[PDB]
Amino acid sequence: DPEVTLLLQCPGGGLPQEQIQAELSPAHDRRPLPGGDEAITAIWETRLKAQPWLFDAPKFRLHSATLAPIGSRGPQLLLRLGLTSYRDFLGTNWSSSAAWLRQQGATDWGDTQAYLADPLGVGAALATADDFLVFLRRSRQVAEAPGLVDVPGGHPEPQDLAGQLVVHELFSSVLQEICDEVNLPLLTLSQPLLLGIARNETSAGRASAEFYVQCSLTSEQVRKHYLSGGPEAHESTGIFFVETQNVRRLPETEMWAELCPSAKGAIILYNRVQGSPTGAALGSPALLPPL
Ligand SMILES: CC(C)(CO)NC(=O)c1cccc(Cl)c1
Secondary structure, three states, rough: OOOEEEEOOOOOOEHHHEEEEEEHHHHHOOOOOOOOHHHHHHHHHHHOOOOOOOOOOOEEEEEEEEEOOOOOOOOOOOOOEEEEHHHHHOOOOOOOOOHHHHHHHHHHOOOOOOOOOOOOOEEEEEEEHHHOOEEOOOOOEEEEEEOOOOOOOOOEOOOOOOOHHHHHHHHHHHHHHHHHHHOOOOOOEOOOOEEEEEEEEEOOOOEEEEEEEOOOOHHHHHHHHHHOOOHHOOOOOOEEEEEEHHHHHHHHHHOOHOHHHHHHHHHHHHHHOOOOOOOHHHHHHOOOOOO
16 A cells, blocks of 8 residues: 555554643744745645635644653653644645655755645544444545545644643544534544554655544444534535444455545554454454454
8 A cells, every 4th residue: 555654553552642742843843945935825826816715724743753662651652743734735745746845855854754744634443332433435526535435534723731732632633523524422432542643645745643433322323413414514425334343354345445545544553553452362263253
């Protein structure tokens, strides 16, 4: 799967909020472009003169993520984060010249991402009470991954001593994206666990944090809540469910070619971190069938 690379696989079946530290620093920002950020401004002007109802928004930038030695006490993950924007994304990662910026970054800074906005996404492996994962169909009329299958998520917007507020906004935002798009009550959702971080190589390497969230509703109740919002209550054009039993072999199915890269990330990390049992009981042949 060339379109997705794993940057981080979390231990212990996934990390809760209380085990993560963030360092939010201007040292973690995008570097100014070699010929100046005028190139970004020019692409933005062109875009607004065709779609003048568009608006900029701030975004978190992922610089890097360092895991503690496995089995250790105390904080287990440090997220190094800067600030970017939708405007910077359109002028770098989404640009036709994104590959040239990656090569220049290797040359100038020894870092393929040095000149890229790299806004941090969030996604969820959302499981039902009757043991299905939730999938959404994208419109065939949007610019990114039209007509492809996605999981719930988005790109959160800003507002250890400012760090803990940043980790809280990241975990909060995955729940908020589930409530906005699936139309679920917040009280049917578990506190999220961070499974890992996945890179979209089709979008010049921008990263998404992938979370596990459990819902107390069955698949039939989740469907009712989704549909009862009506066409204007969601961006997606349909919802569907795959048994967790069948998610194990999803990369061998015809569905795999229809999944956008970030949803592939979420499924690979669910299979490695929540699936793949380590103990004698769940690892027994009757409960973990060979092949
Ligand atoms: C077309 C829209 C407005 C749909 O939500 N695009 C985004 O919000 C978006 C996509 C990729 C990256 C970042 Cl930062 C934003």
